A = this chain, B = another copy of it.
Amino acid sequence: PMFIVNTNVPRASVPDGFLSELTQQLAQATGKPPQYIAVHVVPDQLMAFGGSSEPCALCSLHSIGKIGGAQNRSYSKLLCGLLAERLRISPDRVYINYYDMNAANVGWNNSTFA
A: number of interface residues (CB 8 Å): 63
**By the criterion CB–CB under 8 Å, are A91 and B110 in contact?**
yes
Residues of B within 8 A of A55 (CB): none
Find residues 90-110 in chain A having any chain B CB closer than 8 Å to their own CB. 91-92, 94-101, 104-110
Closest to A40 in B: B47
Main secondary structure on A side of the interface with B: mixed
How many chain copies does the complex carry?
A: 3
Residues of B within 8 A of A105 (CB): 67, 72, 97-100
**By the criterion CB–CB under 8 Å, are B40 and A46 in contact?**
yes
Closest to A77 in B: B110
Residues of B within 8 A of A19 (CB): 46-48, 51, 53
| A48 to B110 Cα, complex, angstroms | 19
